[PDB]
């Protein structure tokens, strides 16, 4: 991806040999920058509604004539709006993004009838998985605000049209916008962005209200719809070794009808439970999480004990084989993330907006068994463990039990 600048907008593109292009506008407008809970979700859902030049209806009917597709999502850091189309249709898609950023009519009826109901279905679908809920609850305990804000709009905190219009006034500005083109000729994109996004406000960099603070604790979400448990550890100094540690501890199986050879996968034997270790870098803080879902609260409890033990055992000793396995699993995870257009866009988006130079999968560091064990030791001995239980919470573990 050749980084350049076109009329004050950061543009990154990589030409390829395929008939299909992906253009993604990445906005510094994710939930950590939210002003009101849920506004970044609502603003994401308000993309490609009625603009002054082109109605939502006209946009969708024309998009079907190009056979293009539209994908949007919100993270803690970004709102990502992606279009996928045939290479030659690039100018239409650039102009469409320009209309959205410059000329969206944020109309109250769209909020009530279109945007908010879709936002609500989005959340209900995500929450059907209790592991999603547990990991969201864990971020809320660990960070409280900023990274602890909810990503998604909820019913209890109603977002108003004035809320969304204010946030959009900040976010939809040259300082918060990056354009990322996969299989787009870089010279052609710079020319088009330079004509289309010229009259966009300059605005100012959106900032997190307040510094990231770390906290420990417990969240207990009573659902009747399945059981999960996250064990998170907030990280004050995000380091790349936690990727290797997450991949080492593992949890999911690497082949069908098997359990897996990872320490966390081996913790599930004899139970209908699954486990996944994850590491989330957010620049200034991070979160190392182990999520366990299952239908039996008794089994989840059982696995949770083994999970904590596994992390302590890692802090003691890792073999050379295991450290190499972690390098392999981690390089692979990095490679597939840079391939998937969803995550790809946000990776370069973070390089363009924030300035965090991307780590190419081929340049993923190999951590010695010493470095891995030291990282695990630093986690087992954390002052601020977070535990989020979801489901039959009376039967799930507590932080002090773990």
Partner 1 sequence: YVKKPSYKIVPHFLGFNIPTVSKWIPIFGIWGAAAGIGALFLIEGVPRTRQDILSKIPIIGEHWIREIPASDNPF
CB of 19 vs partner 1, minimal distance in Å: 13
Q: In what order do the strands lie in the sheet with 286-294?
A: 217-221, 386-390, 227-235, 286-294, 273-281
One residue of 62, 113, 162, 317 binding partner 1 per CB under 8 A: 62
Q: Which is nearer to partner 1, 67 or 270 (CB)?
A: 67
Q: Interface mask (CB under 8 A) for partner 1, residues 188-227, using x and -?
A: x---------------------------------------
Q: How far apart are CA 284 and CA 346, in angstroms?
A: 17
Q: Which ranges of 317-396 does DSSP label H, i.e. alpha helix?
A: 320-339, 341-353, 369-380
Q: How far apart are CA 105 and CA 56, in angstroms?
A: 10
CB of 62 vs partner 1, minimal distance in Å: 5
One residue of 88, 108, 225, 340 binding partner 1 per CB under 8 A: 88
For the chain, the first-to-last Cα distance in angstroms comes to 45
Q: How far apart are CA 345 and CA 26, in angstroms?
A: 7
Nearby residues of 256 by Cβ (< 8 Å), 6 or more positions away: none
Buried b (16+ CB within 10 A) or exposed e, 201-224: eeeeebeeeeebebebbbbebeee
Q: Which is nearer to partner 1, 95 or 374 (CB)?
A: 95
CB of 99 vs partner 1, minimal distance in Å: 13
**In this structure, what is the dihedral angle of CA atoms 135, 138, 144, 146, given to the nearest 10 degrees?**
-30
CB of 103 vs partner 1, minimal distance in Å: 17
Strands 386-390 and 217-221, sheet pairing = parallel
Number of residues that bind partner 1 (CB under 8 A): 10
Q: Which is nearer to partner 1, 36 or 90 (CB)?
A: 90
Among the listed ranges 62-70, 280-288, 290-298, 383-391, the one in contact with partner 1 (CB under 8 A) is: 62-70
One residue of 89, 127, 218, 313 binding partner 1 per CB under 8 A: 89
Q: How far apart are CA 359 and CA 351, in angstroms?
A: 10
Q: How far apart are CA 198 and CA 170, in angstroms?
A: 17
Q: What are the DSSP calls for 170-236, one per residue?
A: HHSSGGGEEEEEET--HHHHHHHHHHHSTTS--------SS------EEEEE--SS-EEEEEEEEES
Site for partner 1 contains 16 (CB under 8 A): no
CB of 56 vs partner 1, minimal distance in Å: 16
Q: Which is nearer to partner 1, 60 or 259 (CB)?
A: 60
CB of 67 vs partner 1, minimal distance in Å: 10
Q: Which is nearer to partner 1, 188 or 218 (CB)?
A: 188
Among the listed ranges 86-94, 130-138, 150-158, 353-361, the one in contact with partner 1 (CB under 8 A) is: 86-94
Among the listed ranges 6-14, 82-90, 139-147, 352-360, the one in contact with partner 1 (CB under 8 A) is: 82-90
One residue of 65, 255, 320, 383 binding partner 1 per CB under 8 A: 65
Q: Quick check: 353 and 175 in contact, CB under 8 A? A: no
Using DSSP's 3-state secondary structure scheme, residue 24 falls into strand
One residue of 15, 35, 66, 221 binding partner 1 per CB under 8 A: 66
One residue of 15, 95, 127, 342 binding partner 1 per CB under 8 A: 95
The residues of the shown chain that bind partner 1, judged by CB under 8 A, are: 62, 65-66, 88-92, 95, 188
């Amino acid at each position: 991806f050749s980084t350049a600048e076109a009329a004050g907008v950061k543009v990154a593109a990589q030409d390829g040999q395929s008939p299909i292009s992906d253009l993604s506008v990445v906005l510094r407008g994710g939930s950590r920058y939210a002003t009101v809970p849920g506004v970044s979700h609502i603003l994401e859902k308000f993309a490609f509604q009625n603009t002054v030049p082109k109605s939502a209806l006209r946009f969708v009917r024309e998009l079907e004539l190009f056979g293009g597709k539209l994908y949007t999502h919100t993270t803690r850091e970004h709102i990502v709006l992606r279009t996928q189309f045939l290479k030659q249709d690039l100018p239409y898609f650039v102009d469409a993004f320009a209309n959205v950023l410059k000329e969206t009519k944020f109309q109250q009826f769209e909020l009530t009838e279109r945007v908010a109901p879709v936002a609500e279905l989005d959340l209900l679908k995500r929450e059907s998985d209790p592991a999603f809920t547990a990991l969201e609850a864990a971020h809320e305990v660990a960070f409280r605000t900023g990274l602890g804000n909810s990503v998604y709009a909820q019913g209890y905190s109603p977002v108003t049209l004035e809320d969304v219009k204010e946030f959009a006034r900040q976010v939809y500005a040259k300082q918060n916008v990056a354009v990322v083109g996969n299989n787009v000729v870089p010279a052609d994109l710079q020319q088009l962005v330079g004509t289309a996004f010229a009259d966009l406000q300059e605005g100012s960099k959106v900032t997190q209200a307040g510094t990231t603070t770390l906290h420990g604790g417990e969240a207990r979400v009573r659902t009747s719809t399945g059981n999960a448990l996250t064990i998170a550890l907030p990280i004050a100094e995000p380091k790349p070794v936690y990727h290797a540690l997450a991949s080492f501890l593992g949890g999911p199986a690497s082949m069908p009808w098997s359990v897996g050879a990872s320490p966390l996968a081996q913790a599930t034997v004899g139970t209908h439970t699954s486990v996944k270790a994850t590491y989330h870098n957010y620049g200034d803080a991070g979160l190392f999480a182990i999520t366990i879902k299952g239908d039996s609260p008794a089994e989840i409890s059982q696995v949770a004990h083994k999970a904590v033990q596994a992390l302590k055992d890692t802090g003691a000793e890792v073999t050379e084989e295991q450290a190499a396995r972690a390098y392999a699993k981690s390089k692979f995870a990095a490679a597939e993330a840079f391939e998937n257009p969803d995550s790809s866009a946000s990776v370069i988006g973070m390089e363009l907006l924030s300035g965090v130079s991307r780590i190419a999968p081929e340049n993923v560091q190999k951590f010695t068994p010493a470095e891995l064990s030291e990282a695990a030791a630093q986690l087992s001995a954390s002052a601020k463990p977070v535990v989020a239980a979801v489901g039959q919470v009376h039967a799930l573990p507590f932080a002090d039990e773990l």
